Structures are given as structure tokens and as C-alpha cells.
Design an enzyme around this catalytic site. Structure first.
Site, PDB file in Angstrom:
ATOM      1  N   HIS A   1      23.798 -45.141  -9.527  1.00 27.16           N
ATOM      2  CA  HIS A   1      24.828 -44.891 -10.580  1.00 27.16           C
ATOM      3  C   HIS A   1      25.754 -46.107 -10.657  1.00 27.16           C
ATOM      4  O   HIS A   1      25.979 -46.627 -11.785  1.00 27.16           O
ATOM      5  CB  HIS A   1      25.590 -43.575 -10.377  1.00 27.16           C
ATOM      6  CG  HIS A   1      24.692 -42.386 -10.309  1.00 27.16           C
ATOM      7  ND1 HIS A   1      23.724 -42.143 -11.267  1.00 27.16           N
ATOM      8  CD2 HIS A   1      24.557 -41.423  -9.374  1.00 27.16           C
ATOM      9  CE1 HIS A   1      23.049 -41.065 -10.944  1.00 27.16           C
ATOM     10  NE2 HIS A   1      23.541 -40.588  -9.782  1.00 27.16           N
TER      11      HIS A   1
ATOM     12  N   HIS B   1      32.116 -34.938  -1.687  1.00 26.97           N
ATOM     13  CA  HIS B   1      30.921 -34.859  -2.566  1.00 26.97           C
ATOM     14  C   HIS B   1      30.488 -36.281  -2.935  1.00 26.97           C
ATOM     15  O   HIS B   1      31.276 -37.020  -3.542  1.00 26.97           O
ATOM     16  CB  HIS B   1      31.185 -33.983  -3.787  1.00 26.97           C
ATOM     17  CG  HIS B   1      30.216 -34.237  -4.887  1.00 26.97           C
ATOM     18  ND1 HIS B   1      28.858 -34.098  -4.714  1.00 26.97           N
ATOM     19  CD2 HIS B   1      30.410 -34.627  -6.159  1.00 26.97           C
ATOM     20  CE1 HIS B   1      28.248 -34.389  -5.844  1.00 26.97           C
ATOM     21  NE2 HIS B   1      29.184 -34.724  -6.750  1.00 26.97           N
ATOM     22  N   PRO B   2      29.228 -36.696  -2.638  1.00 27.90           N
ATOM     23  CA  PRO B   2      28.733 -38.024  -3.010  1.00 27.90           C
ATOM     24  C   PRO B   2      29.024 -38.308  -4.483  1.00 27.90           C
ATOM     25  O   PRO B   2      28.584 -37.547  -5.296  1.00 27.90           O
ATOM     26  CB  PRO B   2      27.240 -37.985  -2.705  1.00 27.90           C
ATOM     27  CG  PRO B   2      27.136 -36.949  -1.618  1.00 27.90           C
ATOM     28  CD  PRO B   2      28.193 -35.917  -1.945  1.00 27.90           C
TER      29      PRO B   2
ATOM     30  N   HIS C   1      20.820 -42.961  -4.321  1.00 23.51           N
ATOM     31  CA  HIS C   1      21.133 -42.219  -5.576  1.00 23.51           C
ATOM     32  C   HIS C   1      22.511 -42.635  -6.106  1.00 23.51           C
ATOM     33  O   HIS C   1      22.608 -43.087  -7.296  1.00 23.51           O
ATOM     34  CB  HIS C   1      21.032 -40.702  -5.343  1.00 23.51           C
ATOM     35  CG  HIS C   1      21.428 -39.845  -6.500  1.00 23.51           C
ATOM     36  ND1 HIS C   1      20.584 -39.549  -7.537  1.00 23.51           N
ATOM     37  CD2 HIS C   1      22.572 -39.214  -6.788  1.00 23.51           C
ATOM     38  CE1 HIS C   1      21.203 -38.781  -8.400  1.00 23.51           C
ATOM     39  NE2 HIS C   1      22.423 -38.563  -7.976  1.00 23.51           N
ATOM     40  N   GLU C   2      23.531 -42.520  -5.249  1.00 25.08           N
ATOM     41  CA  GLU C   2      24.925 -42.860  -5.636  1.00 25.08           C
ATOM     42  C   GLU C   2      24.995 -44.335  -6.050  1.00 25.08           C
ATOM     43  O   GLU C   2      25.567 -44.618  -7.132  1.00 25.08           O
ATOM     44  CB  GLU C   2      25.888 -42.560  -4.496  1.00 25.08           C
ATOM     45  CG  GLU C   2      26.035 -41.075  -4.204  1.00 25.08           C
ATOM     46  CD  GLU C   2      26.445 -40.185  -5.367  1.00 25.08           C
ATOM     47  OE1 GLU C   2      27.316 -40.589  -6.137  1.00 25.08           O
ATOM     48  OE2 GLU C   2      25.895 -39.098  -5.501  1.00 25.08           O
TER      49      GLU C   2
ATOM     50  N   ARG D   1      16.995 -20.707 -10.631  1.00 26.75           N
ATOM     51  CA  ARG D   1      17.014 -22.078 -11.211  1.00 26.75           C
ATOM     52  C   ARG D   1      15.975 -22.934 -10.480  1.00 26.75           C
ATOM     53  O   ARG D   1      15.044 -23.424 -11.148  1.00 26.75           O
ATOM     54  CB  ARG D   1      18.413 -22.696 -11.122  1.00 26.75           C
ATOM     55  CG  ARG D   1      18.516 -24.065 -11.777  1.00 26.75           C
ATOM     56  CD  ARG D   1      19.945 -24.549 -11.921  1.00 26.75           C
ATOM     57  NE  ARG D   1      20.015 -25.858 -12.555  1.00 26.75           N
ATOM     58  CZ  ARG D   1      21.142 -26.509 -12.818  1.00 26.75           C
ATOM     59  NH1 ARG D   1      22.308 -25.938 -12.568  1.00 26.75           N
ATOM     60  NH2 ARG D   1      21.101 -27.725 -13.331  1.00 26.75           N
TER      61      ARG D   1
ATOM     62  N   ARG E   1      25.445  -9.317 -10.973  1.00 25.58           N
ATOM     63  CA  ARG E   1      25.400  -9.108 -12.447  1.00 25.58           C
ATOM     64  C   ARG E   1      26.214  -7.867 -12.831  1.00 25.58           C
ATOM     65  O   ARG E   1      26.869  -7.898 -13.888  1.00 25.58           O
ATOM     66  CB  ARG E   1      23.946  -8.964 -12.908  1.00 25.58           C
ATOM     67  CG  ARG E   1      23.167 -10.272 -12.921  1.00 25.58           C
ATOM     68  CD  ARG E   1      21.870 -10.170 -12.143  1.00 25.58           C
ATOM     69  NE  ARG E   1      21.239 -11.468 -11.953  1.00 25.58           N
ATOM     70  CZ  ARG E   1      21.579 -12.343 -11.013  1.00 25.58           C
ATOM     71  NH1 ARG E   1      22.500 -12.031 -10.117  1.00 25.58           N
ATOM     72  NH2 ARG E   1      20.996 -13.528 -10.972  1.00 25.58           N
TER      73      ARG E   1
ATOM     74  N   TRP F   1      16.967 -12.053 -23.827  1.00 25.09           N
ATOM     75  CA  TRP F   1      17.112 -12.757 -22.535  1.00 25.09           C
ATOM     76  C   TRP F   1      15.938 -12.368 -21.614  1.00 25.09           C
ATOM     77  O   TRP F   1      15.205 -13.258 -21.154  1.00 25.09           O
ATOM     78  CB  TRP F   1      18.421 -12.440 -21.856  1.00 25.09           C
ATOM     79  CG  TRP F   1      18.605 -13.161 -20.534  1.00 25.09           C
ATOM     80  CD1 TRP F   1      18.654 -12.611 -19.298  1.00 25.09           C
ATOM     81  CD2 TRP F   1      18.809 -14.565 -20.290  1.00 25.09           C
ATOM     82  NE1 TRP F   1      18.858 -13.513 -18.319  1.00 25.09           N
ATOM     83  CE2 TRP F   1      18.966 -14.735 -18.889  1.00 25.09           C
ATOM     84  CE3 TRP F   1      18.908 -15.683 -21.113  1.00 25.09           C
ATOM     85  CZ2 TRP F   1      19.207 -15.976 -18.308  1.00 25.09           C
ATOM     86  CZ3 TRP F   1      19.134 -16.921 -20.541  1.00 25.09           C
ATOM     87  CH2 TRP F   1      19.283 -17.068 -19.151  1.00 25.09           C
TER      88      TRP F   1
ATOM     89  N   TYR G   1      19.347 -31.461 -18.121  1.00 26.15           N
ATOM     90  CA  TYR G   1      18.493 -31.328 -16.925  1.00 26.15           C
ATOM     91  C   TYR G   1      17.028 -31.510 -17.333  1.00 26.15           C
ATOM     92  O   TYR G   1      16.352 -32.422 -16.753  1.00 26.15           O
ATOM     93  CB  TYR G   1      18.793 -30.025 -16.194  1.00 26.15           C
ATOM     94  CG  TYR G   1      20.247 -29.972 -15.797  1.00 26.15           C
ATOM     95  CD1 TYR G   1      20.792 -30.904 -14.944  1.00 26.15           C
ATOM     96  CD2 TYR G   1      21.114 -29.040 -16.314  1.00 26.15           C
ATOM     97  CE1 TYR G   1      22.131 -30.910 -14.602  1.00 26.15           C
ATOM     98  CE2 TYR G   1      22.458 -29.008 -15.975  1.00 26.15           C
ATOM     99  CZ  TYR G   1      22.974 -29.946 -15.106  1.00 26.15           C
ATOM    100  OH  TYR G   1      24.275 -30.005 -14.722  1.00 26.15           O
TER     101      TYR G   1
ATOM    102  N   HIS H   1      27.173 -22.885 -15.489  1.00 28.92           N
ATOM    103  CA  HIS H   1      27.161 -23.721 -16.725  1.00 28.92           C
ATOM    104  C   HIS H   1      27.527 -22.865 -17.951  1.00 28.92           C
ATOM    105  O   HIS H   1      28.437 -23.273 -18.711  1.00 28.92           O
ATOM    106  CB  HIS H   1      25.839 -24.415 -16.929  1.00 28.92           C
ATOM    107  CG  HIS H   1      25.515 -25.301 -15.788  1.00 28.92           C
ATOM    108  ND1 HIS H   1      25.623 -26.680 -15.896  1.00 28.92           N
ATOM    109  CD2 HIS H   1      25.085 -25.014 -14.522  1.00 28.92           C
ATOM    110  CE1 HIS H   1      25.290 -27.167 -14.699  1.00 28.92           C
ATOM    111  NE2 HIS H   1      24.953 -26.176 -13.856  1.00 28.92           N
TER     112      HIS H   1
END
Ligand SMILES: *[C@@H]1O[C@H](CO)[C@@H](O[C@@H]2O[C@H](CO)[C@@H](O)[C@H](O)[C@H]2NC(C)=O)[C@H](O)[C@H]1NC(C)=O
Ligand SMILES: *[C@@H]1O[C@H](CO)[C@@H](O[C@@H]2O[C@H](CO)[C@@H](O)[C@H](O)[C@H]2NC(C)=O)[C@H](O)[C@H]1NC(C)=O
Ligand SMILES: *[C@@H]1O[C@H](CO)[C@@H](O[C@@H]2O[C@H](CO)[C@@H](O)[C@H](O)[C@H]2NC(C)=O)[C@H](O)[C@H]1NC(C)=O
Ligand SMILES: *[C@@H]1O[C@H](CO)[C@@H](O[C@@H]2O[C@H](CO)[C@@H](O)[C@H](O)[C@H]2NC(C)=O)[C@H](O)[C@H]1NC(C)=O
Ligand SMILES: *[C@@H]1O[C@H](CO)[C@@H](O[C@@H]2O[C@H](CO)[C@@H](O)[C@H](O)[C@H]2NC(C)=O)[C@H](O)[C@H]1NC(C)=O
Ligand SMILES: *[C@@H]1O[C@H](CO)[C@@H](O[C@@H]2O[C@H](CO)[C@@H](O)[C@H](O)[C@H]2NC(C)=O)[C@H](O)[C@H]1NC(C)=O
Ligand SMILES: *[C@@H]1O[C@H](CO)[C@@H](O[C@@H]2O[C@H](CO)[C@@H](O)[C@H](O)[C@H]2NC(C)=O)[C@H](O)[C@H]1NC(C)=O
Lengths: 711, 72, 126, 67
Positions: A359, A326-327, A355-356, A254, A150, A458, A496, A486
Site C-alpha cells: 500500500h 491494526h496493520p 501487504h502493508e 462470508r 438475527r 434474500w 471485494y 457493511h
């Protein structure tokens, strides 16, 4: 016609768009499959062609106001293509904004932190800093990485982020929006539909409402983790206070996934790991993919395209061939559905395949929609589809019928509590984080949070919503939020939050069709056409219908409900309550890891000056920190004979008030972890108190060093 | 002033009870954790002095306040 | 030939003589590195105030930007102020003298000295 | 100073500037920055070095390391 000409225009546009889009997609696929400069040029040129084409069609769409358009399909496609975007900004404005975006992205990607011990050894966030934040159990080391990230990169983003906010708001306001936050809440916005309409403001209300219903469960999870972290970090965590931000298992907190090693409910109990069975039964990438296909077909989903099997990187090239890994599911277009991933013989890879492929199934289902209406109902629909697939496939039931987990084994409730906690660390752990971050950004974009209070609010929000406390006080020179990808890369985050809810809603609805009798946490939707049918109903819709309607297609609702999420973690919840019986369920937003050695200082200029009483500004504060540093140096060099080079930066000030009262603490010259004990600091002050008073034309009475007194 | 850390000089003889009233509105719980002596002046005036106290306490104290206190 | 006296920074260098015995006399403090650190910090403070008020500019001048040289046992030294992160940008002596004059009192207070004891050669007290 | 991400080593970049650059400010930056970073790090090491070196030489029958 107006509608007729608009429809004709969109028709022609779609024909060319689909083909040109395919060329761009194919080019990108080729370059991803083979990383070559020639391929770089191929994808670049193809992308440029499609982008320019889309821009021209955008202006043509503007020639067809949706007001006269009555057909929803044409109206939706027109509105999507019509969107001017940043183009509304002036040339200079657009160029500046683009430069800020690139600078911010570059700082995030190329920013480095050098070890204080050896300036030559510098770590980047991606590899080194992340490893420390995910593995290191040294409080000091974790604190260094957290603060250094930071202090070095966060400051570099502060000014850029400020300009970014301004330009972003202008563009959205010029695109007919209250702020950039409202611009981002347009995704979930539905109009001109009977009962399926949804306001951009509604999103805020819904998110906040749902969040209040999860608070209880999260509080128990927080209390449980705090208890365990107290053992891992003794004399560091208050059993009634918030959690130090540098101990949450990652750089930002996160996810809490990396806290599992320290929070495993039953250490003696492991978790299902059928990777060994896979290798033992020679489970190649193609075999595991077929299992995925089998699962989907079992629930009544169309068979994987032969083309998929033909053209798809389902395994590492291994040879000289250089390909990203990357999948990723690919809708190249014109019935082209490919998957690119360095697949291995691993339980994770098995679930990733599901998962893939999830999609791909969604893509295939909405592939028959208008080119522009081929996407998930909202930004949280597509990812949720993938998630519920992995969910059903992970169930020991599934693995025992996939022929990987000998069904003779008996699933232990302890291993279930184990599994549920691990999931909660990733699912429930991110909900307050995601909520608070979007809230902060929304308020900042609408101006609710002024620039002078950006860092102030914050950390207030962090301490209150997430229950996480900063180990070091951060003033408005910092941009902690911008230190996350992000934020620094201009990406929405509410996706999310909403996805998580949708995922659980979908899973429950589908399992109800699957006629599940046990705990939802152990539900396998495999071998259920009814579940597949509901799923497909939404799947085939695409963007043609409102997301509220698509919800009713599966879950039957029009808004995100958190009940199913709570239902999933209900077993864990009950368990946590037992563990948190003796513990205090909640946190106090007052305890800080630095409050203990913090000296409160009240200043009375007008009391000692009356008229000609200078205004205490940052310069006066700078002077104060400098004076304290001077005192520390003198004390150490005299009492300890130690030449310690204390700077104004070592003097950490917090809780500044219009009373000119603030709490401060001193750290080692280059060691954030090394906090000079209040005793030494008090002695240092006592020694030079007169000098400090002189510097501010004050006296012991006016310069109240709470805890230090004359005699 | 210390309880709410308000800027020095904001509270006067006039804006004091109203100030603490609005202050209690902000911090109702804390307002009950703050001692507040009662100021009357008439009560101060109506306080009887002890015998000989007036000359060797009241007057002596007032003179200390007076300039060139030894002269007086 | 060459003059071992000429310096590329001497032009904007301000000489400062400190007279502790002249002012404090008995109970006079000893001028050490910490005293010199306080001095550079005080100058940085003055520079910030001057730019923030007269120039309406926020420049974060630090003790590092205060470049001290020719330190003597009479506590005399030449100092020149430089930009916060630009060694090439040396603040003109004129501007620095203005800043010194503006905060002279506070600087004197910091060292418990007076314009007579704290001599900023060229900066004339009025 | 402008972009902290762009860092130059002595031989790769600093030498090129000190050899080719004709900008007063650029040359001043490289010169001072080289001594304000690496030089400050070597100060303490050099002080010990000089001590141990003198010790070894005197132990090998010498006035000092220079002798
Ligand atoms: C997108 O851009 C178009 C074109 O500038 C905007 O349409 C204009 O709207 C204004 C206000 O009603 C009219 O005065 C112009 O004549 C319109 N131009 C054209 C070519 O029709 C449109 O409003 C913009 N959309 C948003 C959301 O900002
Ligand atoms: C609104 O427009 C859409 C798009 O043109 C129409 O959808 C078409 O419907 C016909 C009849 O079922 C199909 O043959 C076309 O292929 C469809 N087109 C697309 C792109 O999906 C829709 O029917 C129109 N609605 C009304 C009420 O006219
Ligand atoms: C769902 O259907 C599949 C396919 O029939 C079942 O897969 C069987 O799993 C068992 C146990 O591993 C094997 O012995 C069978 O040979 C599998 N059959 C096939 C055709 O692959 C699966 O068990 C079913 N799941 C449930 C819960 O009934
Ligand atoms: C899993 O189930 C068993 C059996 O109910 C639980 O063991 C019980 O624990 C309670 C509380 O300590 C005791 O009163 C019972 O006598 C235990 N039963 C047996 C048969 O030992 C066990 O605690 C459960 N595990 C989890 C994770 O909830
Ligand atoms: C920076 O300060 C921290 C805190 O004082 C130091 O961490 C200490 O390390 C020693 C040696 O391992 C332990 O005995 C102490 O208990 C630690 N203190 C705390 C609070 O963790 C750290 O070593 C210092 N780093 C340097 C380079 O001096
Ligand atoms: C750092 O300061 C130096 C000195 O003021 C700046 O160099 C000057 O730049 C201007 C504008 O190009 C020229 O007119 C002067 O002749 C330059 N002076 C010298 C001594 O060469 C330099 O530009 C500043 N750097 C930054 C990054 O602001
Ligand atoms: C290098 O080492 C040798 C061996 O220790 C030294 O030779 C000795 O010198 C001392 C002093 O005159 C005598 O007492 C020893 O008997 C000698 N030893 C041998 C094996 O001859 C020699 O002086 C050393 N050289 C230096 C430069 O220090």
C-alpha cells in the site's frame, strides 16, 4: 477562461487542502500512536477543519461546470470536489438519516445475546458469538448463536434499514442517480475517454458474466466441503442439498476459512510455517520489514523513505504507552509514509508487512498526482496491490531465498493441494456470498425486491447462488443482511468481488513478465524489474487515468477477467473433480434442515364459509400459531403430564401460499435446536383437531392437516 | 388448485383449461405430473345403466340428494 | 384506613364468567391453564383485529399483554389489555369492549361457548 | 423497553429511579420489570430452598425452617 479559472481555483484549493489534510492525518496518527482524550480533541478539531474547508471548496467547484472544462485533470478534480453528497438532502432528512446510521451502528456494536440457560450471561458478537461461530463444533451451540444474533439484533435493524433505504434513494436521486445502488456503481464509471469508457450498469453485467465462469469451480468446492461437513455433522447435511448457514465457520458464511480443520485435503501433510525459523534466526519486526523493503527493491520499487523508518510504529509499545494495533499504511501527506502495527515474530506478520508496504509503495507512486487524484484507480485496485505482495512473499521459494525455509526441503503436491484448498476457502468461498449480497442490495435499492419480499428473496438467492440454506425460516420481521457490519454500517461490498479478480489478473500479468514456467500458485515476482515496471505504470497513474486504462497498464485489459483466478486454482479444480466423482456436484434448493418435521396445512375458508368468509391475515396466522401451541401444551400435559409452556413463537411457519397452504414445525419453548418430532405434533393435532377447526369455523375437510386424517 | 397452490375460487368452469395452460407455462414439467379426469356431461348422459339399476341405483341416489329423502 | 378492594387496574378490568355446564353440559371440557392461555391469546387476537381494522394500526398484542386477575372456580376473572411492551399503557375498557364485541363470535367458537355461557360483564350481546 | 442495549442493574439504576424518579410510568416500569425478570428466575430456586431448609431444620429437631 471558465477552464482557466476552474484550474486556478483547483490549484489554490490543492495547496491548502494538502497542508490541512496533512495536519488532520498527523493528528490522527498521534492519537492512534497515543490514545489520549487530549489527542481525541486534537484529531477531532483537525478533522473538523479539513471537512469544513473541503465543503467550502465543494461549492466553489460547483461554480465551475465540468461541461465547459476540457482538461481531464481539472475536470476529474472538479467533479470529485463538486459532488454535493447527502448535503442535497433537507436538514430534517439529513439529521434523520444520520440518526438511523448511528442507531444501526450502535445496535451492531452494542447488541448482546444472553444464554437461554442463564439470562445473566450475555455475549456480544465481536468476542463471544464470533468465537463460537469460528471454533464451536456443537450443531446446537452454533445454531443458537446464528439464530439468536438475527432474532435479537436483526429485528432491531429491520425498521431502521427500511427508512435508511428510502432516505438513501432520495439523496442519490437528488444527486442525479437512478437509486443508491447506481450511486454506488458510479465508482467504476468512466466517460469522455476513447475505448476506456465504462457504464455504471456495465458493472452489473460484468460481475454476473464473470460469476457464471466461476460457478463450476465453486460447485466442486461446495460439494467437497458438504461431504466433509457430513462427517463433522452426521444426520444434519443432505448430500444433494444446500449447506446449513450456521455451519460455515463464521456468523454469516462470508469466508469458509474456519472450515479448513474439517476439510484439510491431507491431514498428515502440514503447511509451511517459517515463524520458528524467524524466531530461531532472531527475526525482529524491523528485520522482517527490511525483508519486505528488500523484496520491493528486488522488483525495482523505490527504497523505503528514511522518514518511514524514523516515524513508524513497527512494534507493540509494551510500556504504559497505549496505541491501537491494526496493520495500516499512512499517507500523512507532504512526503509522509508511515506504518502502524503491533508486529510480532510470525510468518503472518512477515506477510502482513509485505501487504502493508505494498500500500505504501502505491501511495508513494501516486503521491506526485494532483491531491484529489492521489488514490487507487477504483475501490478494488489498492487492496489487490497489497494482496499480490503477500502472494509472492508466501511462496516457499521466496521463504527459502529469504533464508527461512531450508531449500533442501521438497514442496509436496499434497501440501500444495492443502494450500490451494485453504486459499479457496477464503477466496472462492466469499465470491458467491459477495455477489449475492450486492445483487440483493442493488435490487432492494432499485425497488426490484419489495419490502414484503426482502427476507423472501434474500433466502431464495442464498439457496440458489451460494447454495446455503437457513436452519430456521425467517419472515419479514427479520433483517439477516443488516446483521452483517457493511450492510448495517452503509458500506459498498462489490469492492471485494472486483478486487479478487483484479488481484489474480495483476499477479498473472506480473508473473508473465517474471517469466514463470510452473503452476501460477507457486510464482515469485521477486527479482523482476519488468513485473515492477508494469506494476509501477499503473501505480504512478493514481486516479488521473480511467481504471480500464490502468488495467491495460498491467493486465492489458479494460475489464475484470476471472480466467487468472481459475488458472490459479486449476490444480485444485482437477483434484476436486476426482473427489466429487462419486459425489453429486450441485445442490437442490428444496431440502431444508426443518422440512423433515414440517406439517403442511391447507385452509379452505370459502369451501366451508362461502359468503362471510373472513380474509386470512397475519392475525389469523397469529391465532393459528397460538392454537397449535395450545394443542402442544394439552398433549404434553395429558399424555406426558409435562407442563411445557409452548408459545406461538415456538410454532415455526414457512412456505405460506395464497392457497392458505403453509409448512409448520414446533420447537421447545426456549430451544431452537430442540424441534418437537412430527409424530408428537401429529398426535397433539389429532387430540385438539376439533378445537382448532372450531377456532377457524373450519372442519377436517377445510382445515387439511396433511398427514392427519379422521377415522 | 393444489398443484400450483393457487387462491381458492380463481379457477372456474370458464377459466380452467386456459388456467392450466398458463399454469403449464409456469410449471411445464409439473403439469405432466397431474392426473385430470375428463368431464363431458353428454358422455355422462350417454352412459347406459345396468338392469334394474335405474330404479334401485339411479333414482335411489338422486333421492338421497333430494331433501326429506325418506319422504320421496 | 384503606380498602383492600381498590386496585390501580380495576377500573379497566373486564369481568368474564364462563358457563361450561350451562353450554356444553355433558362432555364439557375442564378449564385449565391451557384454556386460560387460549383465552388470553384469543383476546390478543381480537385486540389486533380491532386496531388493524377500526384504527388501521398494526399493534402486536400478545397473551402476555392480557392481564388476568381474581380467577374463581366459576371460571370468573377480571382482565385488562395493555400495550405490547408498555405496562404503563393500559388499553381503555371502552376500546377493549369494542374489540370484544367485534370478535365475540370467534372467541365463542374458540371455547365452543355462546354469549349466554361466555359472559363478558358490561359487554352486552345484541 | 425503548433501547434494549441500555440495561439497568438494581443498585446502579433501578434503585436511583425508585428513590428519585417521580414519573408514575418510569417507577411502574422499574418495579414491574424487576419482578418480571429476576423474580421469575428466583421462583423455582426459592421453592427448592424452602424444601431443603425445612428438611435441615426438622432434621435438627424443629417444626420448620421458620421455627
Ligand atoms: C449539486 O448542487 C448544485 C447546486 O444546487 C446543483 O446545481 C444546480 O442544478 C440545477 C439543475 O440544473 C440548477 O437549476 C441550479 O441553478 C444549479 N445550482 C447551481 C448553484 O449551479 C447540481 O446539479 C447538484 N448536482 C447533483 C448531481 O445533484
Ligand atoms: C491538464 O491539467 C493538468 C493539471 O494542471 C496538466 O498537468 C500539468 O502538466 C504540466 C506539464 O507537464 C506540469 O508542469 C504540471 O505540474 C502538471 N500539473 C499537474 C497537477 O499534474 C496537464 O498538462 C493539462 N493537460 C493539457 C492538455 O493541458
Ligand atoms: C532474489 O534476489 C535475492 C537477493 O540477491 C536473493 O537472496 C538470496 O537468497 C539466498 C538464499 O536464501 C541467500 O543465500 C543469499 O545470500 C541472498 N542474497 C542476498 C543478497 O540477500 C534471492 O535468492 C533471489 N531469488 C531467486 C529466486 O533468485
Ligand atoms: C502427488 O504426486 C504423486 C506422484 O504422482 C501422486 O501419487 C500417485 O497417485 C496416483 C493415484 O493414486 C497413483 O496411481 C500413482 O501411482 C501415485 N504415484 C506414486 C509415485 O506413488 C500423489 O497422489 C500426488 N498428490 C496429489 C495431491 O495429487
Ligand atoms: C436443545 O435441543 C437440542 C436438540 O434436541 C439438544 O441437543 C441434544 O443434546 C443431547 C445431549 O448432548 C444429545 O444427545 C442430542 O443428540 C442433541 N440433539 C441434537 C439434535 O443435537 C440440546 O441439548 C437442547 N438444549 C437444552 C438446553 O435442552
Ligand atoms: C406508556 O404508557 C403510559 C400510559 O399511557 C405513558 O404515560 C403517559 O404519557 C403521556 C404523554 O407523556 C402523558 O400525558 C400521560 O399522563 C402518561 N400517563 C401516565 C399514567 O403517566 C407512557 O408515555 C408510555 N410510554 C411509551 C414509551 O410510550
Ligand atoms: C447434632 O448431632 C448430634 C450427634 O449426632 C446429636 O446428638 C445425638 O442425638 C441423638 C438423638 O437424641 C442420640 O441418639 C445420639 O447419641 C446423640 N449423639 C451424640 C454424639 O451425643 C444432636 O441431637 C444433633 N442436634 C440436632 C439439633 O439435630
Amino acid at each position: 477562461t471558465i477552464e482557466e479559472q476552474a484550474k486556478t481555483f483547483l490549484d489554490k484549493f490543492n495547496h491548502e487542502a494538502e497542508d490541512l489534510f496533512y495536519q488532520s492525518s498527523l493528528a490522527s496518527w498521534n492519537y492512534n500512536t497515543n490514545i489520549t482524550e487530549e489527542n481525541v480533541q486534537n484529531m477531532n478539531n483537525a478533522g473538523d477543519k479539513w471537512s469544513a474547508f473541503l465543503k467550502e471548496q465543494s461549492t466553489l467547484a460547483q461554480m465551475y461546470p465540468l461541461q465547459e472544462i476540457q482538461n481531464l485533470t481539472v475536470k476529474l478534480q472538479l467533479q470529485a470536489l463538486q459532488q454535493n453528497g447527502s448535503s442535497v438532502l433537507s436538514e430534517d432528512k439529513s439529521k434523520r438519516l444520520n440518526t438511523i446510521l448511528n442507531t444501526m451502528s450502535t445496535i451492531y456494536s452494542t447488541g448482546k445475546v444472553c444464554n437461554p440457560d442463564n439470562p445473566q450471561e450475555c455475549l456480544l458478537l465481536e468476542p463471544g458469538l464470533n468465537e463460537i461461530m469460528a471454533n464451536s463444533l456443537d450443531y446446537n451451540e452454533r445454531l443458537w448463536a446464528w439464530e439468536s444474533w438475527r432474532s435479537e439484533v436483526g429485528k432491531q435493524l429491520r425498521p431502521l434499514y427500511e427508512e435508511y433505504v428510502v432516505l438513501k434513494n432520495e439523496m442519490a436521486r437528488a444527486n442525479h442517480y437512478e437509486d443508491y445502488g447506481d450511486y454506488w456503481r458510479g465508482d467504476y464509471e468512466v466517460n469522455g475517454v476513447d475505448g476506456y469508457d465504462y457504464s455504471r450498469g456495465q458493472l452489473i453485467e460484468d460481475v454476473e458474466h464473470t460469476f457464471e465462469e466461476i460457478k463450476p469451480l465453486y460447485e466442486h468446492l461446495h460439494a467437497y466441503v458438504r461431504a466433509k461437513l457430513m462427517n463433522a455433522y452426521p444426520s444434519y447435511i443432505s448430500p444433494i442439498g444446500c449447506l446449513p448457514a450456521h455451519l460455515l465457520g463464521d456468523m454469516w458464511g462470508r469466508f469458509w476459512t474456519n472450515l479448513y480443520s474439517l476439510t484439510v485435503p491431507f491431514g498428515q501433510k502440514p503447511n509451511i510455517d517459517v515463524t520458528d525459523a524467524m524466531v530461531d534466526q532472531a527475526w525482529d519486526a524491523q528485520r522482517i520489514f527490511k525483508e519486505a523493503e528488500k523484496f520491493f527493491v528486488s522488483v525495482g520499487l523505490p527504497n523505503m523513505t528514511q522518514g518511514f523508518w524514523e516515524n513508524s510504529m513497527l512494534t507493540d509499545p509494551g510500556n504504559v504507552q497505549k496505541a491501537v494495533c491494526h496493520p495500516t499504511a499512512w499517507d500523512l501527506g507532504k512526503g509522509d509514509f508511515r506504518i502502524l502495527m503491533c508486529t510480532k515474530v510470525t510468518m503472518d506478520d512477515f506477510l502482513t508487512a509485505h501487504h502493508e508496504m505494498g500500500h505504501i509503495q502505491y501511495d508513494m507512486a501516486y503521491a506526485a498526482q494532483p491531491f484529489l487524484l492521489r488514490n487507487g484507480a477504483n475501490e478494488g485496485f489498492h487492496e489487490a496491490v497489497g494482496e499480490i505482495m503477500s502472494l509472492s512473499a508466501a511462496t516457499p521459494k521466496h521463504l527459502k531465498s529469504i533464508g527461512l525455509l531450508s531449500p533442501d526441503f521438497q514442496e509436496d503436491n499434497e501440501t500444495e493441494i492443502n494450500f490451494l484448498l485453504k486459499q479457496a476457502l477464503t477466496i472462492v468461498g466469499t465470491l458467491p456470498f459477495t455477489y449475492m449480497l450486492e445483487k440483493w442490495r442493488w435490487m432492494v435499492f432499485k425497488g426490484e425486491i419489495p419490502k414484503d419480499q426482502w427476507m423472501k428473496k434474500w433466502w431464495e438467492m442464498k439457496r440458489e447462488i451460494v447454495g446455503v440454506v437457513e436452519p430456521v425460516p425467517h419472515d419479514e420481521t427479520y433483517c439477516d443482511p443488516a446483521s452483517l457490519f457493511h450492510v448495517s454500517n452503509d458500506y459498498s461490498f462489490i469492492r471485494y468481488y472486483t478486487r479478487t479478480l483484479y488481484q489474480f489478473q495483476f499477479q498473472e500479468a506480473l508473473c508473465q513478465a517474471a517469466k514463470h514456467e510452473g503452476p501460477l500458485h507457486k510464482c515469485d515476482i521477486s527479482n523482476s524489474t519488468e513485473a515492477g515496471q508494469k506494476l509501477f505504470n499503473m501505480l504512478r497513474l493514481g486516479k488521473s487515468e480511467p481504471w480500464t486504462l490502468a488495467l491495460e497498464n498491467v493486465v492489458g485489459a479494460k475489464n475484470m477477467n476471472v480466467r487468472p483466478l481459475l488458472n490459479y486454482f486449476e490444480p485444485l479444480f482437477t483434484w476436486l473433480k476426482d473427489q466429487n466423482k462419486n459425489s453429486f456436484v450441485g445442490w437442490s434448493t428444496d431440502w431444508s434442515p426443518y422440512a423433515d418435521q414440517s406439517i403442511k396445512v391447507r385452509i379452505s375458508l370459502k369451501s366451508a364459509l362461502g359468503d362471510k368468509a373472513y380474509e386470512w391475515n397475519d392475525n389469523e396466522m397469529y391465532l393459528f400459531r397460538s392454537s397449535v401451541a395450545y394443542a402442544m401444551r394439552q398433549y404434553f400435559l395429558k399424555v406426558k403430564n409435562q407442563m411445557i409452556l409452548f408459545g406461538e413463537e415456538d410454532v415455526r411457519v414457512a412456505n405460506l401460499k395464497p392457497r392458505i397452504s403453509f409448512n409448520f414445525f414446533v420447537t421447545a419453548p426456549k430451544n431452537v435446536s430442540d424441534i418437537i418430532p412430527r409424530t408428537e405434533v401429529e398426535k397433539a393435532i389429532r387430540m385438539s383437531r376439533s378445537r382448532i377447526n372450531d377456532a377457524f369455523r373450519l372442519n377436517d375437510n377445510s382445515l387439511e392437516f396433511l398427514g392427519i386424517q379422521p377415522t | 388448485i393444489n398443484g400450483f397452490d393457487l387462491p381458492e375460487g380463481n379457477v372456474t368452469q370458464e377459466n380452467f383449461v386456459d388456467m392450466q395452460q398458463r399454469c403449464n407455462a409456469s410449471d411445464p414439467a409439473a403439469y405432466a405430473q397431474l392426473v385430470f379426469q375428463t368431464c363431458d356431461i353428454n358422455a355422462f348422459l350417454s352412459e347406459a345403466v345396468e338392469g334394474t339399476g335405474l330404479a334401485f341405483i339411479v333414482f335411489t341416489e338422486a333421492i338421497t340428494k333430494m331433501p326429506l329423502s325418506p319422504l320421496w
